[PDB]
């Protein structure tokens, strides 16, 4: 309990010091992995050889909306297609809707209307921070052992 | 925040204490906010269900005397 | 016998397993396991090196080499290491297979070295070290992936002015020429200033004191204070009036600023406070030396023996106004009294901190230009023109010499592979191109490190000085020869 | 005197990724699993937070040591 | 329970779990042990069914509830 | 060499024309099969991915290795 108060609090903190929220349950990361998917590809614009790794970096964003449902026992790939077909009738209107995973119904759901949403400053340094964390790891070649 | 670290039932419980803590202490304005404010106690003998939410501050050495009143409505602290 | 040259070769190798992936900007990060359970991922190639613990003295060999020069410049460590390495990769095989005697080896990267330096006196272009603008992209080298970045244009002004104040050329033939007389050591030497700002730096020429005025009611502004230095300070004198006496020897000359290395008692403060001369004490001895060149004033030990030949001129202000929360003394004046002392200000003690080390290391790169006013093509185009160069010079030396000369080329050609091996393209398509460019091309064609593709060095100016090319085969020969010259190896006191 | 490489940790770093991530796989989410954690001091906790799993637990392996900062 | 040594942890949460009932109410120590300890047979065959132990948790939270009510 | 081989079929399409693109081994870069003159019979490929694709398919299909008969 001592663990969920003093994680609330500092929640709710960023909330009141910065005016952005962004929407939770992986609507945020199942829009980001699919358009930057899509952008690239119209836009050709960075290379031909970066772009491999670039859709490395996309398809590592989908293992939170499949981490949430795998807990649940419920099909990663099923709640994936649902929310590719939700997203492909919101690009040929203009308007805005945003969709997200719902873990008791199993369906898509509206983000705006189920009421969750999550922080702006931890999201933005969740990507930045991720990103040097991991390239890091990636860099050592070989393993040194020494000082004894 | 909450249905993460718990079975969440007791988030029902502790929607309304957590929501009314931030806007109790912090006043709207510019300002900032600070979180060390906020006091923490912790007791072992009731249940977390029936947690509540604290607007002033708790001691924990009370005088002991049989005849002291139960309850005292709009006292003077000195 | 023979297993001692080849765990000499081993051991250099195995040093150099390390810094294979280290040089070159795009050097990737490495993890030293500890045997308390820490480690260090950072990627600077001899902050690891110390950390290393080995066990073949020859990799010890490589240590001490490879601190010495990270002294004298900052970077170059691994370079020197990877060059001398694999020249014992290319003769390994010369010197055991082809039974050739190690000081024939020897000899030959004796004569290798000299047409080497030859090499790249040709490939050096000509560079103006008087031009403000010529030496920012210079410097740049050791600012750029720095929190320097953003003042690199503000920083090149505190490190231009350092250099061309102590530098005296003095050409002539008579006594010998030293080319611009560099001293960084003594003179330009910095101390940290705390508060204030980083744009608003400037470079002060004199002594600076953090000292404020040991007295409640003094003037806190002296028009031309004249700077009085001595040993022994004031008090009562002990075996290993008095102390007016003392006092009235030094206003002999009437001075009206008072310094004293030690402590200075409160009896002679109010001796010397009716004569309209500051006391300032506590003052150490190094900066002593430094006090009388910005003034002039001898030093003398026994205060009786002072002498009146001290002078306060050259003296620009007395303002004592309080800085960062503490009063400090500022000796500048509008001359250069052959030194100077940079003030670096900033918001933080961190910054201080960080600024301190890269001014360093951008002033030693500064002198690298300034000493040989020339420059060389970077990214292993020097390092591949000359390979070419020895093949040329291969045919006609005509002797036994011959052969191991020819593996000089060959480890010339492993710093452009180095950082292919790092760009990530096909080492093999790479090199057999940029080896034909050179012979066409003026030796203008380098290789690019964030793109990877090969291309000439004119467009985007990447230009080093000679004196690191010169240091980095100069050492990297005489670190594979003194390897090549224990043949023997022996244990116990 | 041979050029050629070695691998022999990225995928022993990832191996010793794939572990870690599995820990705190089933812990993410509302819907997640809740892990007891006690090392030496008899003390029952359950807590989903990811810092403070990995300073309950002292691991040698130098994967989960950069992830633990 | 408070004389014998227990060696797994998980046995811990069944003990702590008694003492609540030996301090508050004092009576149905055996009724909360047995119980608990039938609760998790029950449901192995449900772990092993493939039935996630998430949607086994929520099942008895909707199961408590309409217990209370008649009780 | 498949960067090369992506950049140049997508340039084809814009162009409003017919180019085939090839892999050439030689030099390295892509090729014009029709000019260099590789070419595969119809029957060769028609049988190679049909019998490809049945035969990797039913290798998926194995529940269990079962021994018996010894």
């Known amino acids: 309990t001592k663990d969920a108060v003093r994680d609330g609090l500092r929640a709710v903190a960023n909330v009141l010091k910065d005016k952005n929220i962004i929407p939770g349950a992986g609507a945020f990361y199942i829009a980001l992995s699919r358009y930057l998917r899509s952008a690239n590809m119209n836009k050709l ?17 989908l293992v939170i909306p499949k981490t949430l449902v795998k807990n649940s026992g419920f099909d990663p790939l099923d709640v994936l297609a649902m929310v590719e077909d939700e997203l492909d009738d919101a690009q040929d209107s203009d308007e ?11 369906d898509s759901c509206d983000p705006t209307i189920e009421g969750i949403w999550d922080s702006y400053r931890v999201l933005r340094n969740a990507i930045t921070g991720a990103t040097g964390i991991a390239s890091n790891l990636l860099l050592c070649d070989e393993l040194l052992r020494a000082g004894r | 925040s909450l249905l993460t670290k718990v079975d969440a039932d007791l988030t029902e419980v502790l929607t309304p204490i957590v929501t009314d803590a931030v806007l109790s202490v912090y006043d709207a304005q510019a300002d900032n906010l600070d979180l060390h404010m906020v006091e923490i106690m912790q007791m072992q003998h009731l249940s977390p269900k029936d947690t509540t939410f604290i607007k002033g501050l708790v001691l924990d050495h009370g005088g002991r005397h049989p005849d002291m009143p139960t309850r005292v409505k709009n006292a003077y602290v000195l | 016998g023979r297993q001692a ?3 000499n070769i081993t051991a250099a190798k195995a040093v150099a397993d390390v810094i294979r992936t280290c040089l070159g900007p795009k050097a990737m990060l490495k993890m030293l396991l500890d045997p308390m359970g820490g480690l260090v991922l950072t990627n600077d190639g001899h902050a690891i090196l110390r950390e290393i613990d080995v066990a073949h003295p020859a990799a010890k060999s490589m240590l001490e080499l490879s601190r010495t020069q990270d002294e004298e410049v900052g970077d170059g460590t691994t370079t020197v290491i990877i060059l001398a390495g694999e020249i014992l990769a290319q003769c390994a095989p010369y010197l055991i297979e082809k039974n050739i005697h190690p000081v024939i080896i020897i000899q030959a990267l004796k004569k290798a070295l000299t047409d080497a330096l030859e090499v790249i006196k040709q490939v050096s272009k000509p560079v103006d070290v008087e031009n403000d603008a010529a030496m920012k992209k210079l410097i740049q ?7 320097v970045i953003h003042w690199s ?13 102590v530098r005296k050329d003095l050409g002539q033939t008579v006594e010998g020429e030293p080319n611009f007389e560099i001293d960084i050591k003594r003179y330009v030497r910095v101390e940290k200033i705390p508060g204030g700002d980083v744009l608003d730096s400037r470079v002060l020429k004199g002594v600076l004191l953090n000292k404020d005025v040991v007295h409640p009611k003094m003037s806190r502004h002296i028009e031309n204070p004249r700077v009085v230095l001595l040993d022994c300070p004031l008090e009562y004198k002990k075996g290993e009036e008095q102390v007016q006496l003392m006092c009235e020897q030094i206003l002999a000359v009437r001075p009206t600023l008072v310094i004293t290395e030690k402590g200075v008692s409160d009896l002679a403060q109010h001796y010397l406070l009716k004569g309209g001369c500051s006391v300032l004490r506590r003052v150490k001895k190094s900066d002593n030396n430094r006090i009388a060149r910005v003034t002039g004033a001898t030093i003398v030990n026994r205060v009786e023996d002072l002498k009146e030949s001290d002078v306060g001129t050259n003296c620009g202000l007395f303002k004592v106004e309080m800085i960062g929360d503490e009063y400090f003394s500022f000796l500048d004046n509008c001359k250069e009294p052959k030194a100077c002392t940079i003030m670096l200000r900033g918001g933080s003690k961190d910054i201080l901190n960080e600024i301190d080390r890269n001014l360093q290391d951008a002033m030693a790169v500064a002198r690298n230009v300034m000493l040989s006013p020339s420059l060389s093509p970077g990214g292993g185009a020097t390092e591949m023109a000359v390979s070419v160069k020895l093949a040329e010079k291969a045919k006609q030396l005509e002797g036994i010499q011959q052969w191991p000369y020819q593996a000089v080329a060959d480890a010339m050609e492993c710093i452009p592979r180095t950082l292919i091996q790092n760009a990530g393209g ?6 057999s191109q940029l080896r034909a460019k050179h012979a066409q091309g003026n030796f203008t064609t380098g290789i690019d490190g964030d793109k990877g593709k090969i291309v000439d060095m004119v467009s985007y100016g990447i230009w080093e000085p000679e004196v690191i090319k010169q240091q980095s085969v100069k050492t990297a020969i005489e670190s594979a020869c003194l390897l090549l010259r224990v043949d023997d190896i022996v244990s116990g006191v | 005197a041979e050029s050629l490489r070695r691998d022999a940790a990225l995928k022993v770093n990832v191996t010793s990724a794939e572990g870690l991530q599995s820990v705190l796989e089933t812990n993410l989410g509302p819907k997640g699993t809740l892990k007891m954690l006690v090392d030496g001091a008899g003390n029952i906790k359950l807590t989903k937070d990811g810092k403070v799993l990995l300073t309950e637990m002292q691991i040698q392996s130098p994967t989960a040591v950069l992830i633990a900062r | 329970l408070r004389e014998l040594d227990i060696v797994h942890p998980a046995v811990k949460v ?28 029950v449901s192995e065959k449900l772990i092993s069914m493939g039935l996630s132990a998430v949607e086994i948790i929520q099942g008895y939270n909707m199961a408590r509830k309409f217990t209370l009510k008649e009780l």
């Open chain 3, 5 to 7: 040259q080849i765990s």
């Open chain 1, 96 to 106: 805005t809707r945003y969709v997200g995973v719902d873990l008791n119904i199993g």
């Open chain 1, 45 to 61: 614009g960075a290379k031909g050889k970066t772009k491999t790794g670039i859709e490395a970096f996309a398809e590592a964003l």
């Open chain 3, 426 to 431: 096909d080492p093999i398509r790479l090199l």
């Open chain 3, 141 to 147: 080298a050791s600012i750029g992936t720095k929190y």
């Open chain 5, 14 to 41: 069944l003990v702590m779990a008694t003492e609540q009932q030996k301090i508050d109410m004092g009576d149905g120590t055996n009724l909360v042990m047995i119980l608990a300890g039938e609760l998790l047979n």
């Open chain 3, 153 to 165: 244009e503000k920083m090149c002004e505190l490190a231009l002015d350092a250099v061309k104040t």
